[PDB]
């Protein structure tokens, strides 16, 4: 029909949000490790928990259901997989 | 037929044990209180012939399962109390405990995909070791309720030899519920969980939780599906240990026990497993030569002032006949040393051929003394030294055999930090613990799933 | 001989669809042999899967049934029969994980030798393929000449071809460990693997679970496959039955052909053969419903079927196809619901989406037979009722029958390697990927 | 097929006696049909027959081994087959008391369809009735010629008879309380009863107090029978051979027309095809050794078909007349013994203890059947080694082809229902009677 037009360049919008949640998580990822780096060589802890919390619920509270799974990417991205 | 003749003629304080236990009772012996000779020996005579806390082949079955886990193929969860008291020695409370370390395990059975050997600390935790004998105003340190009491009057601080048999009475009555509780319905998988998953609904951080959680529960309806049975999923075994420390006690508790074969061996018949203290293991004193002879599976808390050198020599002392599991070495470093000093300790025992189990401690060495002069530990300080301890074995690919923490299952403000954000000023509301500040109930079952996702890695 | 006979004399008596053109008199010289033979399944067996699909229907499990549109005498062999056990076994276990209930096994296997055709019209063979029960698939009047004595050639195949499944869920080729292992495998090895990944790790850490919670068990090394096809041929059908006896003495008419017998959208006439031979078996029995079925056929076939309000004993196929699901289904649902009967709820979303490619094979989109089974999924959770199960067409053979799936089957490969007698089946890897999908809608 | 090739040239290349003469070029078109249908059993199953046979050899279990003399297809329905699988289970669960072991259960089944016969023709020129793989019972000149079709006709039976024989075992035939009521209506109701009442009267207290122990388990609901038949005919064993691929990688080659196959008493030449053929196979193996045998012939029997030294994988079977056991067999078991192999010791108390009576027909008494065996176990006390299983032919059905037991069948009777087509069988009630005898003579 007319509908693939429409669909194929709402594609080409949903590839364009999707490098730039890409590139942000990338930076994000960055920003995360040198704090961790910065905050290890003062002789504090890999993770701080209610930090680790806060974000979680943050993002619930912003897009529901996925919002700790969300943050959760970011977190184990940011400061890597415990153990 | 010279085995026919023979059939039918054959038909119709052993050896050196007492030379050890004469050197070890002759060793210097920090910790000890102060009181009368002969009113202790009386005691000791007393508690020589009463029923043992456990029996020998309870002790044997362990020694298996400390096996496995130090082979690889499972993980230790100890725990509980700093320090029992007999006012505090209460169906409730132990029950409070129990379900803890049970619920706790069932999080990291899921996460080590191991079995999970349970050890309590309870059922003798009754003497703690002083930097000092006195207070500040002359007054005799409460020592644990094997040797006084907590209140601070003279009466009260005396040093009673008499406590030993209360601390056994209490001690039995203790383990005798906690073989009740494991074996009627509180140690049933599915009870538990429905208990995890309240965890997990009423937590201010279940979202930190709810994914493993779903995992888990998925990972059950999955068992039950495939058409497995009540089976072995109703019950489990509980362990209890304690601090070896008091002479007078553990020499009463000491039992002969002859195996299968017709093997003799003695073993301290106060708890299943017993450990060494940080003030208490010089290598030339009682401690750590009375562990060296008793059968028991050891435990040895090693801070940041241990070299790999010293690591290795307790290492031959306590396990000499190379046995897997017979030793733990727990590591109470401190979440800033762990990192540090542990890799070297691991590879030289590792290089000496000895398997003992790595168990971190994340307690004692994160205590500090808040504004309001309270005794704490920071959540965040306790994750990270666990967090540090695997850090270290996978690095080196060496086994993370266990975790050692104070918990109870009472809803106290002795911890600060968790997904209740206890502050200095929450710590007054409800401090209970006789020693040192516990985590509470949520604060361990928050720490359990952190523990599963560093297994899981 | 029962006072019985009268519901037999009956049903014999109505006009079948779908039936040969052969000698009668042969024909039943061909049945009284096989009313002495050994039969497929024995009746306790029938029994355990009756009370099995009551645990279906009342919502406390899953039924999966699948296999070849079409068996033959020629595919009938260990390699293919081995490697379509496996298959669904394989699928079972993902199902399993995900609806968190036991997952019934059922295969279309030994006795699927009979298909339905619009009226055996050709221009010089003019015999059109009616399965390997009646006639040969070569295009020449000798081959497609309709044969009663392929009944005992299909009898001898359906008894092989039991045996060795039964043989091999018995040995090791159902143990979950080893399945689970060939899964990891399909997930290693897919390009869409990566789809699959997370929930595969998640059944994995379930398995280690089970392990380290000190269960071993029986349950785990083996595993129940139960046999169905279409009753379609009058002859064999009624030649395999045979009464049996319980342990509390009731005697009851079972057809023996298989553990699970349905009827076919173009051979359902209330006043004809099938529907009246299904209402007379004591077998759980099928029905396949189209996308022109309204709720009042739907509740005049449960009536007529299940009789004796039997949660378990009729299962309705929804065949509607991934546009119409959603609008049919519900009243079908909600009607049969009201009227007090406790069927199982099963897709069949193969039937509904076939087509005929631009180079003339006949084909069905992965995306359209995933569709179906998602509005399925989607119907019941609206109505609160019980997804029950799926019927799907497949081969744990590398074809290229269906489109789409990871490898991304285009209408250009389908040439390459189409080998179905019969419907375009779904290969391993379009399968396993279908079943972690469905786990998935299970999950919800 | 490198190392194997070269004895497989070597066994084919051999003299096989006890052959049909028919069209060579026939019997290879047969073949090359048998070559791909699915096997009777599958190789992970005659692994584990094999595990089971090595702790029989090592004196930790025992082998009942029994059924029909002679399977015919007219024969192999649902009843007779039931009938002879309930007697066996029967029979095991008494000799599963006596032996304070494990009893592996081996049915004389699903091919046993090929005798020797003394001479070709008979006296008239007519051929003789070779077994219903080769000809007709029918003594005709048509009905007698050698048909290698039946090859195929003796798969498609076998296939429906193993297929059965596994549905009867998983689906309740074998559940271990069930047979125990069989065993007591059979105690109830025998002339004989008062005989067995004490040993059932043990065994059920033993049954009633695992219950009490509270042993609930699906160990007791279901039970293994493995199939066998004598290897005779060359076609049929060589179109049925497989290679099987183990879990650590190593093919090796199995005959799969059967769990075990054993060698005739007819057809054991060292030189000859069927000794080799054993050889080659990865099937557990049986031979029938007579009184004529030697220590040293026996020692190059074990050599030959056991050079790898697996204890179970040969059994001896040995059927030497009751009046002979005790002389022959003592010297050949110390020189097998001696020679370092671990066999199974196997009594056939049947074969060397057949006459024929006044009125023309063969038959076997009782008491000589019974004298076999307990010579046989007198044997292995003595040199204190391992009674390890017995063969006996039999059915469940009331038959008057053996003389004796607690009905007294004597000359007069055998006319009466006597039905084999090849030798005379235990009835029901004498296989039940010999299962308690020999479940004594394994208590001692
Ligand atoms: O302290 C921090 O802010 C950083 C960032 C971090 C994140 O990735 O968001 C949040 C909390 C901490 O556990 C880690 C990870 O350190
Ligand atoms: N008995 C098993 C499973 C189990 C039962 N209760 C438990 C409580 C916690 C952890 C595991 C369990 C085990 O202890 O390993
Ligand atoms: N027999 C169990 C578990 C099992 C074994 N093999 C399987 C294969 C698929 C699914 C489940 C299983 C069940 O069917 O529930
Ligand atoms: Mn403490
Ligand atoms: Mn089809
Ligand atoms: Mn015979």
């Not at chain 2, 050196?16 to 009386?42: L, V, Y």
């Not at chain 2, 140690?187 to 888990?216: M, Q, T």
């Not at chain 2, 209970?432 to 361990?444: F, G, I, M």
Request: some cysteine; charged content about 25%.
């Amino acid at each position: 029909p007319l509908s693939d037009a429409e669909i194929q360049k709402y594609r080409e919008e949903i590839n364009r949000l999707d490098r730039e949640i890409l590139d942000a998580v990338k930076r994000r990822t960055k920003i995360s490790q040198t704090i961790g780096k910065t905050r290890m060589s003062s002789g504090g802890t890999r993770l701080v928990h209610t930090r680790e919390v806060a974000i979680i619920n943050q993002f619930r509270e912003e897009i529901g259901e996925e919002g700790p799974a969300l943050a959760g990417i970011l977190l184990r991205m940011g400061r890597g997989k415990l153990g | 037929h010279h085995s026919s003749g023979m059939s039918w003629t054959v038909d119709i304080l052993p050896e050196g044990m007492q030379q050890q236990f004469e050197d070890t009772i002759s060793r210097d012996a920090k910790q000890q209180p102060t009181w009368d000779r002969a009113q202790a020996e009386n005691v000791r005579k007393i508690l020589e012939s009463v029923p043992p806390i456990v029996v020998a082949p309870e002790v044997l079955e362990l020694k298996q399962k400390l096996a496995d886990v130090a082979n690889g193929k499972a993980f230790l969860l100890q725990g509980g109390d700093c320090a029992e008291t007999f006012e505090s020695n209460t169906e409730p409370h132990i029950r409070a405990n129990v379900k803890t370390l049970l619920q706790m395990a069932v999080v990291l059975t899921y996460g080590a995909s191991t079995p999970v050997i349970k050890m309590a600390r309870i059922a003798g935790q009754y003497a703690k070791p002083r930097s000092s004998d006195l207070d500040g105003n002359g007054l005799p340190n409460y020592r644990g309720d094997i040797v006084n009491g907590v209140e601070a009057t003279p009466e009260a601080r005396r040093h009673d030899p008499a406590r030993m048999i209360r601390a056994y009475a209490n001690a039995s009555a203790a383990m005798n519920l906690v073989r009740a509780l494991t074996s009627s319905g509180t140690a049933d998988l599915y009870r538990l969980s429905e208990w995890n998953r309240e965890f997990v609904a009423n937590s201010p951080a279940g979202a930190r939780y709810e994914a493993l959680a779903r995992e888990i529960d998925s990972g059950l309806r999955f068992m039950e599906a495939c058409g497995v049975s009540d089976e072995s999923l109703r019950a489990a075994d509980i362990y209890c240990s304690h601090e070896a420390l008091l002479v007078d006690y553990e020499r009463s508790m000491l039992r002969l026990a002859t195996d299968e074969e017709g093997n003799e061996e003695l073993y301290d018949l106060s708890a299943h497993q017993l450990w060494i203290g940080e003030r208490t293991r010089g290598m030339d004193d009682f401690h750590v030569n009375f562990a060296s002879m008793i059968s028991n599976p050891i435990g040895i808390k090693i801070g940041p002032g241990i070299t790999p050198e010293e690591a290795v020599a307790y290492a031959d002392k306590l396990d000499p006949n190379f046995e897997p599991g017979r030793l733990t070495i727990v590591a109470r470093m401190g979440h800033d040393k762990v990192r540090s000093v542990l890799p070297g300790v691991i590879q030289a025992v590792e290089a000496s051929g000895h398997k003992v189990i790595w168990q971190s401690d994340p307690m004692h060495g994160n205590t500090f003394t808040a504004s309001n002069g309270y005794k704490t530990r920071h959540f965040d300080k306790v994750i990270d030294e666990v967090q540090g301890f695997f850090e270290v074995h996978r690095a080196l690919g060496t086994h993370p055999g266990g975790i050692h923490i104070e918990f109870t299952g009472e809803d106290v403000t002795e911890c600060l930090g968790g997904a209740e954000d206890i502050t200095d000023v929450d710590l007054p509301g409800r401090y209970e613990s006789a020693c040192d500040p516990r985590l509470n109930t949520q604060q361990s079952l928050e720490l359990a799933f952190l523990v599963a996702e560093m297994l899981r890695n």
